[PDB]
């Protein structure tokens, strides 16, 4: 019968292509509840100085977002007082006391102007004197590179996801009594459940240079995808790891990532601070997920729609 | 032919209204990967005191969420020791040593009770003595307003989005060799790609008063929407900026935003701290996005559905 | 008429089951803009020491994610210098100076090796000497439990959601002139709008033991669901609170949550720090929401589809 072959072709076209490829027989949940616990390990050395994780990882609480400091411009022994203003500030440069007016407070400056013209930190120029945190970084900062051994650092990312509808839970570390998580190196295939990543590895998979990113700074995403079919065993629900840079790489106006922080002390009853401008690599751990599980209602509805299409066709 | 006009009307109704208005010929991705780098600039003065960004912006790392401090209640020279308890604490007020019992520890109090009744910081009342961080803020705090020039502060928000499916990337700062990002003021039309916002501007677009929000505190969202049609040039994919308050504005029980933080020192071998209760404006940078790009599969499926509807009709 | 009863049955089956149960007459927005302001209250005591919220809550800014410290391993008077390395570090243990080689820098160690073998902190063993932050925690740390009264702590979670499409806004605290938010205890039914939760309560609703979670640490999600039908009064749009643990509870390799932070001082011109390893309970406040409101377009489209199905059937 010609109709036999015609309908055999029609059915298979709308069966193997509708209920198989796109899984019309499944209800879905997009976006699981996730916990990210992070921990960085590794120590680096500058000139007669050893840096530990506490110093170069900020914030310290071990969450999804953190910055590993690779370079600092540090200004020591900063106290409230009078000092020459940065030559980089508008109208700062002066030739006589008459060129500076008292009380003026530029937002982009570094204090309140005194009405005097004082010699700059490095001569021979002169610059308007201000009251504020002194000395200013643009005249007393020292640079330290502490990203020399940062490619050898290690980050442990612990993730556990939950799909409330399906009541499904899976983590990225296996229940193993041996010391696997202490002698293991992540491999997307052989060691997918050792979620310990070197920073150099992460920077290689984002397609970036460790040197450029260590001097200007930047942001690298670590993306974990949980695309699981629950009609199958939980052993098939596994994490997929992706590494890409998130911040612009061609923007010349703002090229990189940086932040300032200070350390406050009291020397002889005077509040003193060391200001640090930190360039570093920020690590975003972003978690995506999509679970699918058989449900009778959607299956029946889609079967009815397919039967209607067959009847029309 | 009457059928000619009938079908001409029917088709246009389900063509210009189905594949044009709602763009049935497009696959979509909702929710891009985003990076937010923030930086606040501006300095403010209190009584013989200049405040910089490091002091009034917390946390300092330059992310999506940060608080600009506008007012502080500060308690200086706090040490572990004995002091009268706040008159604001239940059962704290006493007339004789018999009214206070030793060892009691109220969670809403400020230390461990000693069993004695001592004069309050400001007379003539008496209050039960406690062991803890002393003196208590409700008896030794001084208030400082540092939001006087906060409307003139500036926030630079750098955003770059990524749609992995489409492999589309766009940022909110243009590749310009000139010093545009150094002499530019955001304008939703003329300067949409100078993402430098004054706080006063943000507070005007949220419909709020800077004074009320500076004394009680609050939360303002900065919403960036990326609604892009990829069938068009990337020059059509642009950010849309919105400013609205996120926290309740009529709640009298909890009206505002505040947090406490302390600064720890060691004076003569004794751990001493200055406790700061900070009221301020928290800035949430929230990023929404929806990209659409032509795909043949959805177009064919929707065309088949439209043809079926036409056939029935 | 038989057809009368047949169509009466058919219609009700596809009316009470299509436009009622699944609300086909509604357009939807999934995912509202939310603000979370948190504040923890409660003080705890260790041996001759009173801890306040500033010490045990990190970070302090009052956001969606924060950690309440329950146990610390603290190492005091740490200075850059030479000290024996932790016996827990590979190859650290030595019998003579020849077993240690100078310059070697293990990432999992605690400094730079000097080439000498020195007695360990606790005898009789000997371990290779390193330069770094000294002494090392594994030889000078003291443990403090400060989770004794943590179940009695209180967390105030303030939430306000916004659905931009519907321009709908609702918060979780009512506009009440009385002191309700000062004498109230959350009850999912009687006091759903007192969003002040004890930590013990939260840990009881997650199904966990406060002791196990206080010594190893962990992560508890506080989930707020806003499932609102806008065709009804705003008094029907209410929060639904759920409490569940987010981190794995059977993983032996990594069981818990911890982070390290340090406190920096200057004693006699020398930078000195107290390193704290903190175990605690991290609180994730996660907000889900789904609003539905009548729209004519979807209603007409779904009615047309239902009529087509009826005609075919
Ligand atoms: N909050 C802000 N307000 C105004 N201008 C800013 C702000 N943040 C940065 N800029 C300016 O924009 C340009 C690019 O920003 P970026 O912070 O990357 O550069 P920078 O030179 O490293 O910053 P800095 O001013 O700290 O040296 C710089 O010239 C910087 O001065
Ligand atoms: N974690 C908490 N547990 C119990 N009560 C709280 C908590 N946080 C705030 N409150 C109380 O709820 C009310 C409103 O909160 P809010 O913090 O806005 O007020 P406040 O007076 O500024 O707070 P504070 O108690 O720090 O003075 C205040 O009376 C405050 O004491
Ligand atoms: N970033 C990291 N790189 C390598 N190994 C790690 C890292 N973080 C943790 N580990 C190791 O994995 C195991 C489990 O992690 P976890 O931090 O829970 O244990 P821990 O013993 O409390 O950590 P610590 O090493 O601080 O004592 C521990 O043996 C720990 O040393
Ligand atoms: C300050 O800058 C403005 C703008 O360049 C300039 O016109 C003015 O002369 C400057 N002030 C002085 C005292 O020169
Ligand atoms: C890790 O350290 C080794 C030497 O110990 C070095 O050869 C290697 O390049 C480092 N890995 C990097 C830089 O990614
Ligand atoms: C403590 O407060 C309770 C409740 O108000 C009160 O009954 C009790 O008398 C108070 N304690 C003393 C010693 O008065
Ligand atoms: C910015 O500063 C000017 C004075 O320099 C002031 O007139 C203006 O009101 C400020 N902007 C505000 C408060 O939004
Ligand atoms: C260092 O460790 C390796 C690996 O266990 C070992 O082979 C080597 O002998 C150790 N170094 C010394 C000096 O023993
Ligand atoms: C709260 O404190 C009381 C004593 O004041 C105690 O009995 C109770 O167990 C505490 N709640 C806990 C531990 O959840």
Numbering used by the authors:
A (entry chain C), B (entry chain A), C (entry chain B): 43 to 355
What does the paper say about this structure?
The P2X2 receptor (P2X2R) is an adenosine triphosphate (ATP)-gated ion channel with few small-molecule modulators that exhibit poor pharmacological properties. It is known to be involved in the auditory system and has been proposed as a drug target for age- and noise-related hearing loss. Each P2X2 protomer is composed of intracellular N and C termini and two transmembrane (TM) helices (outer TM1 and pore-lining TM2) connected by a voluminous extracellular domain. Three P2X2 protomers intertwine to form the trimeric receptor, with each subunit adopting a dolphin-like shape, as first established for the zebrafish P2X4R (zfP2X4R).
The ATP-bound desensitized state conformation I was obtained from a purification strategy that closely followed a protocol previously established for other P2XR subtypes. This structure was determined without the addition of ATP to the purified protein sample, leading to the conclusion that intracellular ATP released during cell lysis binds to the receptor. Thus, we refer to conformation I as the canonical desensitized state structure and establish conformation II as an alternate ATP-bound desensitized state structure. The triphosphate tail forms ionic interactions with K81, K83, K200, R302, and K319 and a hydrogen bond with N300. Further, the 3’-hydroxy-group of the ribose moiety interacts with K224 via hydrogen bonding, an interaction unique to hP2X2R. In conformation I, S296 interacts with the α-phosphate of ATP via a hydrogen bond at a distance of 2.8 Å. One helical turn more cytoplasmic, the narrowest part of the gate is formed by the side chains of residue V354 from each protomer and constricts the pore to a radius of 0.8 Å, thus defined as the primary constriction gate. The primary gate in the ATP-bound desensitized state of hP2X2R is now 17.8 Å deep into the plasma membrane, as measured from the start of TM2 (Cα of L338 to Cα of V354). As a result of the deeper gate compared to the apo closed state, the TMD architecture in the ATP-bound desensitized state now adopts a “cone” shape. Unlike previously observed for hP2X1R, hP2X3R, and hP2X4R, the absence of cryo-EM density for any ion coordinating ATP in the pocket suggests that free anionic ATP rather than an ATP–cation complex is the physiological ligand for P2X2Rs.
